[PDB]
Amino acid sequence: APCQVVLQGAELNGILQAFAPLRTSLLDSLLVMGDRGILIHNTIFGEQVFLPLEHSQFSRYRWRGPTAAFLSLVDQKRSLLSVFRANQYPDLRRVELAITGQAPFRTLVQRIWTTTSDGEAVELASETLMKRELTSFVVLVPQGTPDVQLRLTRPQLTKVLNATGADSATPTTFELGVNGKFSVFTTSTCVTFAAREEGNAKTVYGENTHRTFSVVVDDCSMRAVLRRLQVGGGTLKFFLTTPVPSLCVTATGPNAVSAVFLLKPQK
Amino acid sequence: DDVAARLRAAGFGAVGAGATAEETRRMLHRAFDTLA
């Protein structure tokens, strides 16, 4: 088959770990496959959510032809990402994805194998799901380099999230001050750390920590979303120049998800 | 929709629909880069 993707041993373990903290958050999503890997996109509480699976994270990844997108759900209660669900497949041994055909009529056939067989004779052990690509699909994805980056530890991200506002009547400001003082606050909450360029729990590390800014987040769904994705720690990436500023929070780890929030436009 | 307009004003690149195959192929690579 022209397009083949295999998850076995180590890499299957890696994907399984990537999904653990995510629980059911991405079961209903858009699978965007191409030569770079699988980009899983969603919307949570209205916010843009992405989970990139670099091709290098699979046991085998072979892609040819135009990029292809699939709805993860083959039916209301079943999804192409259900295998990776925490403990739904106890004896899980192998997962294979095969895309056959030609745009816009390619088909995705997902085959699963448990510790009840040997190899991948296909016909043998299994559970299989099939999905037709989308003929037409659109996805707006982030790009470009962030103007500032602040890596935060688990407890640090938690302090921040606890500071962010949760309603239209309580704006939140992310401010990188003169001295490299990073602060997040509302009219009833405040938290601050000391930047410092990455060459003591109040010290956060980042890139271009000299570029000050005072951005405000809209109605701020940050806490709800990140709490839902159970993000441990993460890196805050600020895109300050585009007409609409944006803050992307990428989780710390190997195959971490990212949530992108829009900041109020300035000037 | 109002969100697509907001996302476009935020710098988001289009993948699929109104783009050539090489264009969305380039966009996905950029998304993974910035998303990394």
Curated annotation (Swiss-Prot), chain A:
This is DNA polymerase processivity factor. Interacts with the DNA polymerase catalytic subunit UL30. Interacts with the origin-binding protein. Keywords: DNA replication, DNA-binding, Host nucleus. GO terms for molecular function: DNA binding; DNA polymerase processivity factor activity. Plays an essential role in viral DNA replication by acting as the polymerase accessory subunit. Associates with the viral polymerase to increase its processivity and forms high-affinity direct interactions with DNA. Facilitates the origin-binding protein UL9 loading onto DNA thus increasing its ability to assemble into a functional complex capable of unwinding duplex DNA. The keyword ATP-binding does not apply. It comes from the Viruses. Belongs to the herpesviridae DNA polymerase processivity factor family. It is found in: Host nucleus. One of its GO terms (biological process) is DNA replication. Its main location: host cell. GO terms for cellular component: DNA polymerase complex; host cell nucleus. The keyword DNA-binding applies.
UniProtKB/Swiss-Prot annotation, chain B:
It is found in: Host nucleus. Belongs to the DNA polymerase type-B family. Forms a complex with the ssDNA-binding protein UL29, the DNA polymerase processivity factor, and the alkaline exonuclease. Interacts with the putative helicase-primase complex subunit UL8; this interaction may coordinate leading and lagging strand DNA synthesis at the replication fork. Replicates viral genomic DNA. The replication complex is composed of six viral proteins: the DNA polymerase, processivity factor, primase, primase-associated factor, helicase, and ssDNA-binding protein. Additionally, the polymerase contains an intrinsic ribonuclease H (RNase H) activity that specifically degrades RNA/DNA heteroduplexes or duplex DNA substrates in the 5' to 3' direction. Therefore, it can catalyze the excision of the RNA primers that initiate the synthesis of Okazaki fragments at a replication fork during viral DNA replication. This is DNA polymerase catalytic subunit. The lineage of its organism: Viruses, Duplodnaviria, Heunggongvirae, Peploviricota, Herviviricetes. The chain holds residues 1200 to 1235 of 1235 of the full protein.
